[PDB]
């Protein structure tokens, strides 16, 4: 199974109608040349570590 490892490097803020999901810029761990735009449902800090499945998916803005 494809377990992608992520590294929350930059916190962008909070989105969603409810205002809960964090917009986050991710430095890929295994291949450090990939920087993904990811959404997180949970409390995140800087230099964190996520576990994604589709590293080629990006997220502009949330309603």
């Amino acid at each position: 199974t494809p377990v992608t490892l992520a590294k929350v490097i930059k916190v962008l803020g909070r989105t969603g109608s409810r205002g809960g999901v964090t917009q986050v810029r991710v430095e890929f761990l295994e291949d450090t040349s990939r920087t993904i735009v990811r959404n997180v449902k949970g409390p995140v800090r800087e230099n964190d570590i996520l576990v994604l499945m589709e590293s080629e998916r990006e997220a502009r803005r949330l309603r």
């Binding site: 969603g16 109608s17 449902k41 949970g42 409390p43 995140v44 964190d48 570590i49 994604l52 589709e54």
Partner: protein, 206 residues
């Protein structure tokens, strides 16, 4: 181990177990294994406690929560149903019983079994109910490691309590049962079920 005789002497089994560098009476934290890098620093428990009963004031800082013992954390997440609220002695004894079962379940390291359960039962990616205009579709998010561990311990304790209700089995046996069906995920546990379904609807919704 060089024993010491006082006037009122400490029982020999205590002295022996703790001067043999054993952190409980039947277990040790020096043998604990984490699989992902995301769980390493959010599950971390390297201080030996004999009771899994700490006056933790970690509810004052959000990340500070991740430095409170995971066995004490699963212990306080046992205490969920409204009738058992405000009873930590019950949960601690029950966890000690569970550990007495995972040993006699042909598993040499109950602590690594639990940690591997926590590693296996935390959902990688999830969904959120984002607007989209009335008919709210579900955006595939990627849940945090902190909430991964949270949701893990949650699904575990809840599945186990939901199983141990209205059946003769004691809570420790369905908690060991859950933690072992989830230690190495078998799709016979509640937590692996729900994790796989959350990641499945997260997959279908992207």
């Amino acid at each position: 181990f060089t024993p010491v005789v006082l006037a009122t002497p400490i029982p020999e089994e205590v002295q022996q177990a703790q001067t043999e560098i054993k952190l409980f009476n039947k277990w040790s934290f020096e043998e604990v294994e984490v699989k992902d890098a995301s769980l390493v620093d959010y599950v971390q428990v390297r201080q030996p406690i004999f009771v899994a009963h700490t006056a933790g004031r970690y509810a004052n800082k959000r990340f500070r929560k991740a430095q409170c013992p995971i066995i004490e954390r699963l212990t306080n997440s046992l205490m969920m149903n409204g009738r058992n609220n405000g009873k930590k002695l019950k949960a601690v004894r029950i966890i000690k019983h569970t550990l007495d079962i995972i040993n006699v379940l042909t598993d040499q390291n109950p602590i690594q079994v639990v940690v591997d359960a926590i590693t296996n039962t935390g959902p990688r990616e999830d969904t959120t109910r984002v607007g989209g205009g009335g008919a709210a579709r579900r955006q595939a998010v990627d849940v945090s490691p902190l909430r991964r561990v949270n949701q893990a311990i949650a699904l575990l304790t809840i599945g186990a309590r939901e199983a141990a209700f209205r059946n003769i089995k004691t809570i420790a046996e369905t908690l060991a049962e859950e933690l072992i069906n989830a230690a190495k995920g078998s799709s016979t546990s509640y937590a692996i079920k729900k994790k796989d379904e959350l990641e499945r609807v997260a997959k279908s919704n992207r």
